[PDB]
């Protein structure tokens, strides 16, 4: 069926771990979904 | 032969002072501007947005190197 083969990327001086798992996915049925949202200190202190 | 016995005077006075900085005092480093980061958009396969602090952003950076990243009010 010519299934797309994505090569996994390892953390890099400018490409840290959490960045990778958040911005990159190796399962290409999950491409082009939508945008995801997160929070850091103040927006998290409000939300939570 | 030996006519005498004496106490060995010396002038040890340092009065001139020469220091010369080693070459690595003037070598280069990477310095950066540092602002509080208000938010971040990362996109490579899937776009993910973090928001730390919600304010009108006065400044925005864009960086393409591997993953596209937009650092907001960086």
Which of B51, B55, B72 has the highest number of chain A CBs within 10 A, making it the mutation to test binding with A? B51
- Resolution of the deposited coordinates, in angstroms? 3.4
**Residue B63 CB contacts under 8 Å (≥ 6 apart), including other chains:** B69, B70, B71
Q: Do A19 and B52 touch (CB under 8 A)?
A: no
Specify which residues B71 forms β-bridges with.
Answer: B40, B61
Find, in chain B, the residue whose alpha carbon is nearest to that of A16: B67
What's A43's DSSP letter? Answer: H
Tell me the C-alpha distance between A28 and A6, whole Å.
8
Structure solved via: cryo-EM
H-run or E-run covering A22: helix A17-23
Beta carbons of A23 and B48 less than 8 angstroms apart: yes
Q: Where are the beta strands (DSSP E) in A1-48?
A: 36-39
Tell me how far apart the alpha carbons of residues B25 and A24 are, in angstroms, rounded to a whole number: 42
Q: Does B62 touch chain A (CB under 8 A)?
A: no
CA nearest to B73, candidates B47, B45, B36: B36
Distance separating alpha carbons of residues B58 and B38, to the nearest angstrom: 10
Structure tokens of B67? 């993953």
Query: In chain B, which residue's Cα lies nearest the Cα of A33?
Result: B46
- Please check whether residue B70 is in contact with residue B44, taking contact to mean a CB–CB distance below 8 angstroms: no
CA angle B30, B70, B33 (to 5 degrees): 30
Sign of CA dihedral A21, A27, A31, A35: negative
């Amino acid at each position: 069926a010519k299934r797309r083969v994505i090569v996994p990327i390892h953390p890099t001086p400018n490409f840290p771990a959490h960045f990778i798992k958040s911005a990159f996915t190796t399962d290409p049925l999950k491409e082009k979904q939508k945008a995801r949202f997160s929070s850091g200190g103040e927006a998290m202190r409000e939300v939570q | 032969m030996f006519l005498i016995h004496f106490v060995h005077y010396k002038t040890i006075l340092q009065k001139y002072t020469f220091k010369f900085k080693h070459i690595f005092l003037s070598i280069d480093k990477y310095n950066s501007l540092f602002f509080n980061i208000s938010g971040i958009l990362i996109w490579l396969n899937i776009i993910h947005i973090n928001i730390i602090l919600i304010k009108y952003s006065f400044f925005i950076l864009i960086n393409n190197f591997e993953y596209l990243i937009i650092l907001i009010s960086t």
